[PDB]
PDB file of C-alpha atoms in Angstrom:
ATOM      1  CA  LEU A  11      -0.033  -0.002   0.017  1.00 11.14           C
ATOM      2  CA  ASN A  12       1.072   3.624  -0.773  1.00 10.37           C
ATOM      3  CA  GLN A  13      -0.561   5.539   2.114  1.00  4.71           C
ATOM      4  CA  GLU A  14      -1.204   5.564   5.910  1.00  5.53           C
ATOM      5  CA  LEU A  15      -4.409   3.616   6.836  1.00  3.65           C
ATOM      6  CA  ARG A  16      -6.018   6.754   8.380  1.00  3.57           C
ATOM      7  CA  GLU A  17      -5.690   8.654   4.977  1.00  5.34           C
ATOM      8  CA  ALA A  18      -7.159   5.761   2.999  1.00  5.47           C
ATOM      9  CA  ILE A  19     -10.607   6.229   4.784  1.00  7.91           C
ATOM     10  CA  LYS A  20     -11.121   9.446   2.689  1.00  9.45           C
ATOM     11  CA  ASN A  21      -9.163   8.647  -0.552  1.00  8.88           C
ATOM     12  CA  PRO A  22     -12.033   8.842  -3.137  1.00 12.00           C
ATOM     13  CA  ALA A  23     -11.254   5.804  -5.425  1.00 12.46           C
ATOM     14  CA  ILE A  24     -11.926   3.107  -2.618  1.00 13.86           C
ATOM     15  CA  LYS A  25     -14.419   5.146  -0.546  1.00 12.05           C
ATOM     16  CA  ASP A  26     -18.140   4.173  -1.073  1.00 10.87           C
ATOM     17  CA  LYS A  27     -17.128   0.809  -2.880  1.00 15.56           C
ATOM     18  CA  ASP A  28     -17.349  -2.971  -1.969  1.00 14.87           C
ATOM     19  CA  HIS A  29     -16.109  -6.396  -3.171  1.00 18.81           C
ATOM     20  CA  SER A  30     -18.017  -9.635  -2.373  1.00 22.32           C
ATOM     21  CA  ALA A  31     -18.073 -12.792  -4.503  1.00 22.33           C
ATOM     22  CA  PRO A  32     -18.707 -16.709  -4.702  1.00 21.94           C
ATOM     23  CA  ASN A  33     -14.857 -16.859  -5.423  1.00 21.76           C
ATOM     24  CA  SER A  34     -14.470 -16.896  -1.562  1.00 20.90           C
ATOM     25  CA  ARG A  35     -15.286 -18.645   1.810  1.00 26.46           C
ATOM     26  CA  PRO A  36     -15.353 -17.081   5.381  1.00 28.63           C
ATOM     27  CA  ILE A  37     -12.865 -17.506   8.279  1.00 26.09           C
ATOM     28  CA  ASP A  38     -12.172 -16.262  11.944  1.00 29.28           C
ATOM     29  CA  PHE A  39      -9.485 -16.368  14.728  1.00 26.02           C
ATOM     30  CA  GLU A  40      -8.191 -15.935  18.338  1.00 25.29           C
ATOM     31  CA  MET A  41      -5.755 -13.045  19.363  1.00 24.23           C
ATOM     32  CA  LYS A  42      -3.397 -12.211  22.322  1.00 20.96           C
ATOM     33  CA  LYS A  43       0.082 -11.210  23.486  1.00 20.04           C
ATOM     34  CA  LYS A  44       2.582 -12.641  26.099  1.00 21.91           C
ATOM     35  CA  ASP A  45       1.873  -9.740  28.564  1.00 23.23           C
ATOM     36  CA  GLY A  46      -1.710 -11.084  28.877  1.00 26.75           C
ATOM     37  CA  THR A  47      -3.669  -8.813  26.350  1.00 27.70           C
ATOM     38  CA  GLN A  48      -6.637 -10.783  24.763  1.00 29.59           C
ATOM     39  CA  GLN A  49      -8.244  -8.697  21.973  1.00 29.22           C
ATOM     40  CA  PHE A  50     -11.948  -7.869  22.827  1.00 26.70           C
ATOM     41  CA  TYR A  51     -11.962  -4.350  24.426  1.00 29.11           C
ATOM     42  CA  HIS A  52     -11.576  -2.056  21.361  1.00 24.70           C
ATOM     43  CA  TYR A  53     -13.606  -2.857  18.143  1.00 21.95           C
ATOM     44  CA  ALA A  54     -10.614  -2.270  15.664  1.00 21.14           C
ATOM     45  CA  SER A  55      -8.225  -4.710  17.610  1.00 22.72           C
ATOM     46  CA  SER A  56     -10.985  -7.084  18.856  1.00 20.07           C
ATOM     47  CA  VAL A  57     -11.319 -10.639  17.227  1.00 19.44           C
ATOM     48  CA  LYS A  58     -13.026 -10.552  13.750  1.00 18.84           C
ATOM     49  CA  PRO A  59     -14.471 -12.489  10.809  1.00 17.99           C
ATOM     50  CA  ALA A  60     -12.560 -12.627   7.471  1.00 13.79           C
ATOM     51  CA  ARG A  61     -12.706 -14.259   3.955  1.00 12.55           C
ATOM     52  CA  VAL A  62     -10.302 -16.465   2.016  1.00 13.71           C
ATOM     53  CA  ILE A  63     -10.157 -15.733  -1.718  1.00 13.91           C
ATOM     54  CA  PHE A  64      -9.538 -18.587  -4.229  1.00 13.41           C
ATOM     55  CA  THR A  65      -5.945 -18.719  -5.600  1.00 12.04           C
ATOM     56  CA  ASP A  66      -2.990 -21.056  -5.878  1.00  9.63           C
ATOM     57  CA  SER A  67      -1.181 -22.703  -2.801  1.00  6.64           C
ATOM     58  CA  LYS A  68      -0.508 -19.145  -1.584  1.00 12.96           C
ATOM     59  CA  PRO A  69      -4.221 -17.781  -1.158  1.00 12.40           C
ATOM     60  CA  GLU A  70      -5.377 -14.177  -0.671  1.00  9.80           C
ATOM     61  CA  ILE A  71      -7.376 -13.016   2.442  1.00  7.60           C
ATOM     62  CA  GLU A  72      -9.818 -10.072   2.873  1.00  8.80           C
ATOM     63  CA  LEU A  73     -10.271  -8.226   6.235  1.00  7.49           C
ATOM     64  CA  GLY A  74     -12.789  -5.447   7.212  1.00 10.62           C
ATOM     65  CA  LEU A  75     -13.008  -3.424  10.541  1.00  8.27           C
ATOM     66  CA  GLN A  76     -14.480  -0.328  12.205  1.00  9.56           C
ATOM     67  CA  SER A  77     -12.951   2.614  14.077  1.00  6.38           C
ATOM     68  CA  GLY A  78     -11.233   3.501  10.777  1.00  2.84           C
ATOM     69  CA  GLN A  79     -10.593   7.096  12.147  1.00  2.00           C
ATOM     70  CA  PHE A  80      -8.443   5.609  14.960  1.00  2.00           C
ATOM     71  CA  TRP A  81      -5.990   3.150  13.341  1.00  2.00           C
ATOM     72  CA  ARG A  82      -2.778   4.575  11.757  1.00  2.00           C
ATOM     73  CA  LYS A  83      -0.852   1.548  10.330  1.00  2.00           C
ATOM     74  CA  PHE A  84      -0.878  -2.331  10.150  1.00  2.00           C
ATOM     75  CA  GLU A  85       1.674  -5.182   9.320  1.00  2.00           C
ATOM     76  CA  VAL A  86       1.324  -8.971   9.087  1.00  2.00           C
ATOM     77  CA  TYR A  87       4.200 -11.603   9.396  1.00  2.00           C
ATOM     78  CA  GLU A  88       4.711 -15.407   9.617  1.00  2.00           C
ATOM     79  CA  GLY A  89       8.176 -15.863  10.952  1.00  2.00           C
ATOM     80  CA  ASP A  90      10.314 -13.659   8.577  1.00  2.00           C
ATOM     81  CA  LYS A  91       7.726 -13.921   5.699  1.00  2.00           C
ATOM     82  CA  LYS A  92       5.607 -10.736   5.392  1.00  2.00           C
ATOM     83  CA  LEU A  93       2.089 -10.914   3.981  1.00  2.00           C
ATOM     84  CA  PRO A  94       1.691  -7.720   1.902  1.00  3.48           C
ATOM     85  CA  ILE A  95      -1.363  -5.478   2.558  1.00  6.59           C
ATOM     86  CA  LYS A  96      -3.407  -3.477   0.026  1.00  7.22           C
ATOM     87  CA  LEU A  97      -6.501  -1.210   0.231  1.00 10.32           C
ATOM     88  CA  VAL A  98      -9.754  -2.774  -1.125  1.00  7.64           C
ATOM     89  CA  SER A  99     -12.823  -0.608  -0.173  1.00  9.60           C
ATOM     90  CA  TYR A 100     -13.891   1.855   2.601  1.00  8.85           C
ATOM     91  CA  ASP A 101     -16.899   3.612   4.106  1.00  9.40           C
ATOM     92  CA  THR A 102     -16.477   6.937   6.095  1.00 11.48           C
ATOM     93  CA  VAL A 103     -20.308   6.857   6.652  1.00 10.36           C
ATOM     94  CA  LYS A 104     -19.863   3.571   8.733  1.00  9.61           C
ATOM     95  CA  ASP A 105     -16.301   4.501  10.196  1.00 12.71           C
ATOM     96  CA  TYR A 106     -15.253   1.368   8.279  1.00  8.69           C
ATOM     97  CA  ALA A 107     -11.939   0.271   6.633  1.00  6.00           C
ATOM     98  CA  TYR A 108     -11.206  -2.862   4.432  1.00  4.54           C
ATOM     99  CA  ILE A 109      -7.955  -4.462   3.148  1.00  3.23           C
ATOM    100  CA  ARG A 110      -6.537  -7.612   1.457  1.00  2.00           C
ATOM    101  CA  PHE A 111      -3.175  -9.615   1.838  1.00  2.00           C
ATOM    102  CA  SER A 112      -1.425 -12.476   0.074  1.00  2.00           C
ATOM    103  CA  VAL A 113      -1.017 -15.482   2.455  1.00  2.00           C
ATOM    104  CA  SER A 114       1.823 -17.982   3.189  1.00  2.00           C
ATOM    105  CA  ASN A 115       1.293 -21.746   2.560  1.00  2.74           C
ATOM    106  CA  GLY A 116      -1.454 -23.116   4.923  1.00  2.00           C
ATOM    107  CA  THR A 117      -0.935 -20.538   7.743  1.00  2.00           C
ATOM    108  CA  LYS A 118      -1.975 -21.460  11.324  1.00  2.00           C
ATOM    109  CA  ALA A 119      -0.424 -18.739  13.581  1.00  2.00           C
ATOM    110  CA  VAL A 120       0.609 -15.173  12.793  1.00  2.00           C
ATOM    111  CA  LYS A 121       2.761 -12.293  14.208  1.00  2.00           C
ATOM    112  CA  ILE A 122       0.634  -9.061  14.078  1.00  2.00           C
ATOM    113  CA  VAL A 123       1.420  -5.334  14.337  1.00  2.00           C
ATOM    114  CA  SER A 124      -1.253  -2.596  14.686  1.00  2.00           C
ATOM    115  CA  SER A 125      -1.036   1.154  15.633  1.00  2.00           C
ATOM    116  CA  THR A 126      -3.553   3.683  17.074  1.00  2.00           C
ATOM    117  CA  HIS A 127      -3.800   7.359  17.852  1.00  2.00           C
ATOM    118  CA  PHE A 128      -7.137   9.159  18.528  1.00  2.00           C
ATOM    119  CA  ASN A 129      -7.977  12.175  20.932  1.00  2.00           C
ATOM    120  CA  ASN A 130      -5.011  13.059  23.358  1.00  2.00           C
ATOM    121  CA  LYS A 131      -4.363   9.268  23.841  1.00  2.00           C
ATOM    122  CA  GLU A 132      -1.800   6.961  22.004  1.00  2.00           C
ATOM    123  CA  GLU A 133      -2.108   3.215  21.794  1.00  2.00           C
ATOM    124  CA  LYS A 134       0.960   1.580  20.129  1.00  2.00           C
ATOM    125  CA  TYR A 135       2.363  -1.985  19.826  1.00  2.00           C
ATOM    126  CA  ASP A 136       5.346  -4.060  20.993  1.00  2.00           C
ATOM    127  CA  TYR A 137       4.160  -7.633  19.934  1.00  2.00           C
ATOM    128  CA  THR A 138       0.879  -9.468  19.010  1.00  2.00           C
ATOM    129  CA  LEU A 139      -0.234 -13.001  18.059  1.00  2.00           C
ATOM    130  CA  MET A 140      -3.128 -14.408  16.067  1.00  2.00           C
ATOM    131  CA  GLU A 141      -4.095 -18.128  15.840  1.00  2.00           C
ATOM    132  CA  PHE A 142      -6.485 -19.865  13.297  1.00  2.00           C
ATOM    133  CA  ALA A 143      -9.983 -21.307  13.308  1.00  2.00           C
ATOM    134  CA  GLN A 144      -8.823 -23.717  10.396  1.00  2.00           C
ATOM    135  CA  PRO A 145      -5.801 -23.575   7.960  1.00  2.00           C
ATOM    136  CA  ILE A 146      -5.600 -20.505   5.711  1.00  2.00           C
ATOM    137  CA  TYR A 147      -5.254 -22.410   2.419  1.00  2.00           C
ATOM    138  CA  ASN A 148      -6.653 -22.635  -1.215  1.00  2.00           C
ATOM    139  CA  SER A 149      -7.790 -26.312  -1.591  1.00  2.00           C
ATOM    140  CA  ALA A 150      -4.805 -27.483  -3.728  1.00  2.00           C
ATOM    141  CA  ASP A 151      -6.697 -30.839  -4.489  1.00  2.00           C
ATOM    142  CA  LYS A 152      -8.688 -28.844  -7.193  1.00  2.00           C
ATOM    143  CA  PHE A 153      -5.825 -26.576  -8.609  1.00  2.00           C
ATOM    144  CA  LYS A 154      -2.205 -25.463  -7.820  1.00  2.00           C
ATOM    145  CA  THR A 155      -0.747 -24.427 -11.260  1.00  2.00           C
ATOM    146  CA  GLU A 156      -2.213 -25.176 -14.734  1.00  2.00           C
ATOM    147  CA  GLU A 157       0.492 -24.617 -17.432  1.00  2.00           C
ATOM    148  CA  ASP A 158       2.246 -26.255 -20.505  1.00  2.00           C
TER     149      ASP A 158
END
């Protein structure tokens, strides 16, 4: 992505648009860190639904959230492997922000970064963990690569 997440909520090209299609299935998760945070108290960081988009053995995943005026930046890692984020669609009437990223092979647990600043307050990260409902995968048994 080319911008800060907070600026993307007003950028006109993605504001007032969607994307939803039969080319996908839903997913969900658990979240925490080692200091004893368990995500449920703020609606942007709280545990969420998602959707897995049909690809090769590295799939793509789509994520939407609210408090879009509060979040400032996001990053997703599995070990050293970064899952690269892009903008998809936004709604400043719902205070809503929505993104996509390209996933590693069959992901089960993820190292997460998220940043916040609203009002006088600042709420920044050191470390965060997500863990799966089921493997984030593509169903390779039907397609991996079809070439000649």
